[PDB]
Amino acid sequence: QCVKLNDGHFMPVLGFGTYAPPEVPRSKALEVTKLAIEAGFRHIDSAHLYNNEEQVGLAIRSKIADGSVKREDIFYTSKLWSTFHRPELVRPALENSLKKAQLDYVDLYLIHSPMSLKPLSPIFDIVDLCTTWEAMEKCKDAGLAKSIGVSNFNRRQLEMILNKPGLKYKPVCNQVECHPYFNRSKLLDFCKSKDIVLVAYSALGSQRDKRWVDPNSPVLLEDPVLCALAKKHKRTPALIALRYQLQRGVVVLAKSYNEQRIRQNVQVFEFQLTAEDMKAIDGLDRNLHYFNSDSFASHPNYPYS
Ligand SMILES: NC(=O)c1ccc[n+]([C@@H]2O[C@H](COP(=O)([O-])OP(=O)(O)OC[C@H]3O[C@@H](n4cnc5c(N)ncnc54)[C@H](OP(=O)(O)O)[C@@H]3O)[C@@H](O)[C@H]2O)c1
Ligand SMILES: CC[C@@H](C(=O)O)c1ccc(-c2cncnc2)c(F)c1
């Protein structure tokens, strides 16, 4: 249940999202990530910004120790935060992440966002990200990351890397917000044309953080069409939203800190949607990105409109 990447490595098509707001204790990320691996998750999504890499690393190592999984069976992702985009900071930031997680390599390292910040939430900065990508390329050559990609890149920002003079490695993936209300069908078409995997976050709609998400926005999992399809298939609305991405070639993440819902989310491989189901879901696209805050929308390299 993996997809082959542009650089030869493989990525599991269902990933586990580990972000919890700072009010959730970090000991939960350790328990939860162990349960995700117990449930069948082999793709685990973390980042510098998430303040959990020590716990997520320990969880992986703990399951490696108890004879459940081997390191080569786990796909660990980290992300370079936007205060570290200047090239001389890229490798130290990655080495720090491996340090926190106590791992020898990450399977995937991403530029978290194209919106550079002053060298964690400072003020904007102006960085030529082709130089940041060059430092990413060296992290792959050095073996600190098996694969390298980007996150929150729009079409123009992706093209800049692919058009870079003397590019070494193209981005393996682009991790963007993607769900039935914001399905990125044009960006998905472009990524499939360049052999770039689209990885979807907020596929269950969001954690609806009051910092960045308007509480007046519709709740994706309460959508009428998704709920009717859940009743039709005798599944849950979350499983329909996840199966929707797998059937259109999108690697999908799913955060859950609930034992029961983590186990339920791996049932996405058990059933299929029909062609009629898929256009029902495609008709829900309404250009609604849940993350909508002036802090993002004021940045010069803001990927949206
Ligand atoms: N690159 C980026 O900029 C970026 C941005 C955002 C997120 N991400 C990553 O993507 C991951 C997922 O995105 P997300 O944080 O927005 O969370 P999400 O995957 O969209 O899930 C949203 C909510 O759905 C609930 N849920 C999980 N399974 C469910 C189920 N079977 N039925 C009903 N509800 C269910 C969860 O609540 P419970 O916990 O109570 O189960 C969760 O809080 C993140 O953890 C992060 O790793 C990356
Ligand atoms: C902790 C929150 C974090 C995450 O969960 O990864 C996150 C969430 C949203 C964005 C983002 C990017 N580009 C446009 N709008 C929003 C982001 F860069 C980073």
Curated annotation (Swiss-Prot):
Kindly give the InterPro entries that the UniProt entry links to this protein.
Answer: AKR, AKR1C, Aldo/ket_reductase_CS, NADP_OxRdtase_dom, NADP_OxRdtase_dom_sf
CDD domains in the record:
AKR_AKR1C1-35
Q: Enumerate the active-site residues.
A: Y50
- Give the range the annotation lists for the signal sequence: none
What are the protein's UniProt keywords? Cytoplasm, Lipid metabolism, NAD, NADP, Oxidoreductase
Residue positions annotated to bind substrate are: H112
Cellular-component GO terms for this entry? cytoplasm; cytosol; extracellular exosome; nucleus
Q: Pathway it acts in?
A: Steroid metabolism
Q: Which reactions appear under catalytic activity for this entry?
A: a 3alpha-hydroxysteroid + NADP(+) = a 3-oxosteroid + NADPH + H(+); a 3alpha-hydroxysteroid + NAD(+) = a 3-oxosteroid + NADH + H(+); prostaglandin F2alpha + NADP(+) = prostaglandin D2 + NADPH + H(+); prostaglandin F2alpha + NADP(+) = prostaglandin H2 + NADPH + H(+)
Q: How is its activity regulated?
A: Strongly inhibited by nonsteroidal anti-inflammatory drugs (NSAID) including flufenamic acid and indomethacin. Also inhibited by the flavinoid, rutin, and by selective serotonin inhibitors (SSRIs). The oxidation reaction is inhibited by low micromolar concentrations of NADPH.
Residues annotated as transmembrane: none
Where does this protein reside within or beyond the cell? Answer: Cytoplasm
Predominant localisation class: cytoplasm
Q: What is its EC number?
A: 1.1.1.-, 1.1.1.210, 1.1.1.53, 1.1.1.62
Q: Site described as Lowers pKa of active site Tyr, positions?
A: K79
GO terms for MF: 15-hydroxyprostaglandin-D dehydrogenase (NADP+) activity; 5-alpha-androstane-3-beta,17-beta-diol dehydrogenase (NADP+) activity; aldo-keto reductase (NADPH) activity; aldose reductase (NADPH) activity; all-trans-retinol dehydrogenase (NAD+) activity; all-trans-retinol dehydrogenase (NADP+) activity; androstan-3-alpha,17-beta-diol dehydrogenase (NAD+) activity; androsterone dehydrogenase [NAD(P)+] activity
Describe the task this protein carries out: Cytosolic aldo-keto reductase that catalyzes the NADH and NADPH-dependent reduction of ketosteroids to hydroxysteroids. Acts as a NAD(P)(H)-dependent 3-, 17- and 20-ketosteroid reductase on the steroid nucleus and side chain and regulates the metabolism of androgens, estrogens and progesterone. Displays the ability to catalyze both oxidation and reduction in vitro, but most probably acts as a reductase in vivo since the oxidase activity measured in vitro is inhibited by physiological concentration of NADPH.
Similarity comment:
Belongs to the aldo/keto reductase family.
Q: What is this protein called?
A: Aldo-keto reductase family 1 member C3
The organism encoding this protein is Homo sapiens
Q: Which gene encodes it?
A: AKR1C3
